[PDB]
Design a protein around this ligand. Structure first.
Ligand SMILES: *[C@@H]1O[C@H](CO)[C@@H](O[C@@H]2O[C@H](CO)[C@@H](O[C@@H]3O[C@H](CO[C@H]4O[C@H](CO)[C@@H](O)[C@H](O)[C@@H]4O)[C@@H](O)[C@H](O[C@H]4O[C@H](CO)[C@@H](O)[C@H](O)[C@@H]4O[C@@H]4O[C@H](CO)[C@@H](O)[C@H](O)[C@H]4NC(C)=O)[C@@H]3O)[C@H](O)[C@H]2NC(C)=O)[C@H](O)[C@H]1NC(C)=O
Ligand SMILES: *[C@@H]1O[C@H](CO)[C@@H](O[C@@H]2O[C@H](CO)[C@@H](O[C@@H]3O[C@H](CO[C@H]4O[C@H](CO)[C@@H](O)[C@H](O)[C@@H]4O)[C@@H](O)[C@H](O[C@H]4O[C@H](CO)[C@@H](O)[C@H](O)[C@@H]4O)[C@@H]3O)[C@H](O)[C@H]2NC(C)=O)[C@H](O)[C@H]1NC(C)=O
Ligand SMILES: *[C@@H]1O[C@H](CO)[C@@H](O[C@@H]2O[C@H](CO)[C@@H](O[C@@H]3O[C@H](CO)[C@@H](O)[C@H](O)[C@@H]3O)[C@H](O)[C@H]2NC(C)=O)[C@H](O)[C@H]1NC(C)=O
Ligand SMILES: *[C@@H]1O[C@H](CO)[C@@H](O[C@@H]2O[C@H](CO)[C@@H](O)[C@H](O)[C@H]2NC(C)=O)[C@H](O)[C@H]1NC(C)=O
Ligand SMILES: *C/C=C(C)/C=C\C=C(C)\C=C\C1=C(C)CCCC1(C)C
Ligand SMILES: *C/C=C(C)/C=C\C=C(C)\C=C\C1=C(C)CCCC1(C)C
Lengths: 114, 307, 310, 114
């Protein structure tokens, strides 16, 4: 029975900072990759960031290129997202997804409002 | 972000551009040129086109004639049965999908394509296991026709269903490959929930390598008018039947392993689709040899045609 | 009303219930049971399935061999060419449409199905005109010291068949879905004066059907007082020409008769199963002809085996 | 160049009567059939009535069964529709169509408001 916690996030002022979390439970964590995906108000899902199973090579969207940074802990089953120098459009509900896809396992999410 | 995994699928093409779609929901013309999909459908037509008559006539001639009941003929009928299940069960779906550009039937449409194509190759392989044992027993003669061969045909259908069925059950799954026109065992995505990683080890060793050991074991024993030809030409054809099998299925089997190891690496849709569709000649190539080499059958084939 | 006419179509099923839809826009499963549409697609598969190899091999064997250049072989190649144009041009569309239940391709999809199926029957008919003339000239011998022409006789068939099948595509007449709305054919139903299909049907029946039959039975009428090499090559070939017509009359009369019945009784109470049976039955025109060329003419059958069993 | 006139029709009170007209031009009239079709406000077209080319056998919808009656003049190229004992729902825009179909040549018709 798979479970993905969606810790970290809340209300932050423009040009601020925020470090999200994604605790994994009930599967071989380091044998899969993990991504971050957000849900803007009105607009469709955006694939934010992604990283390999080992964690060597991270990839970001052009939207949040360089500003955001993704990193994972294989030992403690966690995926972080240090979001820095935020903007108004980054206002969204953030989810962490498995594999390489935008399909989201059910998660608490996190209301990141900028 | 080299490939694009989904619940059902894995598209070997990055979804940074945002173009990637499910190969059950929409066509995959962004993977390769639209004419390359018609090239598949054209190629796939000829497999169905020359597949049915050769397999049907070979089935007809074998059953019609009360003669021709040597184990060789039983297995080459067994293939002809399976090869028809390929042409109707599998090849129809891929020919239809090749046109549309995606599995418009749905996830079950993929299962058909993979299942019967998996049977065809495994039933053909486990048949070459039986033939290798049969040619061994006659030549080397450890023991001082229509019985053992019939049980040897039961062996192939038992062992092939140990390969192709479990994907349908739950252990492993069938997933679109390359251009997303064919299907096959999930090498690309671990999908631990399904446990396809464990199945691939199972499939390669137990379904494929074990046979190859048994075939080359039996071939290793044979290193040192009727009986002088029926022993030679038949055992010679058994070798040519394997040689053709090794040409056919190694391309796919090698690429399948490459992808199994390098999951998430940078590879395109043309990588797998070439050796995947090449391996679908398994329907036709086997009973071409049975006509081409074995002249005994060729004579009795003409009896059925030219009455 | 009894039927249901539209801009493109005519559905032989009343639209009082409000169920009737265009056979280009939506499926026609209200006409007959859904499995009956799969019965067409299944049947239509076998026409394509046994069509390609027999026509292709017959084309291959005739061209491969420098021998076998008698007028009989030229025409039976000419058929094999047309029969492939049937299988690829026409039969693909109907097999695809039979599955979906409607011409999902569109109005042009209908044109394909009707066009190449019209050619196949006309090229076969005008070929039997040439054969009837050829068997007449050899037996009765109207021109002395006589016995190239076949190649010009093949040009005759393609000229005359295109005088039938092409005009619908141009404007004079049109191709319209028939019966279950899976096949197509010449508009016997709607007058469509704008198209002038009423005038074409008279044209098609007389000029593209009846006139041939007169010429065939005219030439057959010459061989009434009549009926190793010359005693068999005269007999068996001329015998096969008759069997080739006999099969044609079995094949195309069902459709040709029903087409006339509908041409007379436009708007009468008839269902979708009425026309679709003789329509799809006539699509055996692809396969039946070069079965006889193998079955009867053993001379070819020997040389066919040469190509197969090399 | 085909042309269908749509004479007759206007404002009439409930339970009234009205006789429509449809003058044909530029085709062999008596060689095909003609129908009547109406356009209610909001809802789709309704096939009202139809008749054979000769004019022998008329057919009506269940909606206007018996109340309406259709008749044609082959000599003068005309089709009539004696609509009697009208109702509120008969409020529509009436067209006369060719063949047996609902496709309407020309347009405008006649504003029959009850
Ligand atoms: C066989 O028989 C069946 C049933 O008897 C028949 O099906 C009907 O086909 C007609 C078309 O031939 C359909 O009518 C159309 O409906 C359109 C909208 O209707 C939908 O929404 C309503 C909801 O109210 C549903 O009940 C309905 O089922 C539909 O889903 C309508 O837009 C069409 O008409 C407008 O557009 C045409 C084209 O431009 C125009 O010519 C019309 O005049 C009309 O525009 C309006 O005109 C008025 C008058 O000038 C104007 O004031 C108004 O502003 C315009 N409209 C607006 C608001 O913009 C059309 O009527 C009908 O829905 C079908 N019924 C079914 C099955 O649902 C088949 O056609 C028959 N088969 C054949 C063809 O043989
Ligand atoms: C490859 O990458 C592309 C990148 O775009 C992916 O495409 C996106 O897929 C996501 C999948 O969820 C889509 O997100 C959903 O959009 C719905 C609306 O889409 C339509 O309307 C918007 C209007 O704003 C248009 O912009 C858009 O084009 C569509 O016409 C929303 O309604 C969905 O929200 C609902 O469902 C989600 C489920 O997760 C809930 O969380 C929400 O609360 C809500 O109930 C959702 O946001 C997104 O629209 C797609 N983008 C595009 C291009 O339209 C591909 O999916 C990906 N490839 C594959 C198939 O894996
Ligand atoms: C739908 O199809 C039916 C069946 O074909 C059509 O019925 C035909 O209707 C005409 C007109 O009523 C009949 O003509 C009359 O026949 C009688 C007896 O034969 C004759 O005495 C009259 O002088 C006249 O000619 C016709 O017979 C009848 N067909 C039969 C026998 O069923 C019907 O007309 C069609 N519907 C439409 C919209 O036209
Ligand atoms: C896409 O595939 C490329 C090529 O296989 C990957 O690039 C490799 O990245 C690893 C580290 O993750 C390096 O050790 C290799 O040397 C790279 N290969 C070379 C030489 O190009 C890339 O990481 C893949 N991207 C993702 C995230 O799937
Ligand atoms: C075109 C459709 C295909 C290739 C579907 C499935 C094929 C397989 C699962 C093939 C695997 C193997 C076979 C059949 C033959 C021996 C090697 C093998 C186990 C990799
Ligand atoms: C399945 C599709 C079909 C049958 C399409 C068209 C067929 C015709 C237009 C056939 C008409 C006739 C032929 C070919 C043979 C002689 C009689 C004919 C003119 C009625």
């Amino acid at each position: 029975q798979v479970q993905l916690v969606e810790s970290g996030g809340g209300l932050v002022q423009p040009g601020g900072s925020l470090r999200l979390s994604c605790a994994a439970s009930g599967f071989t964590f380091s044998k899969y990759a993990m991504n971050w995906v957000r849900q803007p108000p009105g607009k469709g899902l955006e694939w934010v960031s992604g990283i390999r199973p080992s964690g060597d090579n991270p990839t970001y969207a052009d939207s949040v290129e360089g500003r955001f940074t993704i990193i994972r802990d294989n030992d403690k089953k966690m995926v972080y997202l240090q979001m820095t120098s935020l903007k108004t459009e980054d206002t969204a509900v953030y989810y962490c997804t498995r594999g390489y896809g935008t399909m989201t396992i059910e998660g608490q999410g996190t209301q990141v409002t900028v | 972000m080299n490939g694009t995994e989904g619940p059902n699928f894995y598209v070997p093409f990055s979804n940074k551009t945002g173009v990637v779609r499910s190969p059950f929901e929409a066509p995959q013309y962004y993977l390769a040129e639209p004419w390359q999909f018609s090239m598949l459908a054209a190629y796939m037509f000829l497999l169905i086109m020359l597949g049915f008559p050769i397999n049907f006539l070979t089935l007809y001639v074998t059953v019609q004639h009360k003669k021709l009941r040597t184990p060789l003929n039983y297995i080459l009928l067994n293939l002809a049965v399976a090869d028809l299940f390929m042409v109707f069960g599998g090849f129809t779906t891929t020919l239809y999908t090749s046109l549309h550009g995606y599995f418009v039937f749905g996830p079950t449409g993929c299962n058909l394509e993979g299942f019967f194509a998996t049977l065809g190759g495994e039933i053909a392989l486990w048949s070459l296991v039986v033939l290798a044992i049969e040619r061994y027993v006659v030549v080397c003669k450890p023991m001082s026709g229509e019985n053992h061969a019939i049980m040897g045909v039961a062996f192939t259908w038992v062992m092939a269903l140990a390969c192709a069925a479990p994907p349908l059950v739950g252990w492993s799954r069938y997933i679109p490959e390359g251009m997303q026109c064919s299907c096959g065992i999930d090498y690309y995505t671990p999908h631990e929930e399904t446990n396809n990683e464990s199945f691939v080890i199972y499939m390669f060793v137990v379904h494929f390598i074990i046979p190859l050991i048994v075939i080359f074991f039996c071939y290793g024993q044979l290193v040192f008018a009727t009986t002088q030809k029926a022993e030679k030409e038949v055992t010679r054809m058994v070798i040519i039947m394997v040689i053709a099998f090794l040409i056919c299925w190694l391309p796919y089997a090698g690429v399948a392993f490459y992808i199994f190891t390098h999951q998430g690496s940078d590879f395109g849709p043309i990588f797998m689709t070439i050796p995947a569709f090449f391996a679908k000649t398994s329907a036709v190539y086997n009973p071409v040899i049975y006509i081409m080499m074995n002249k005994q059958f060729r004579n009795c084939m003409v009896t059925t045609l030219c009455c």
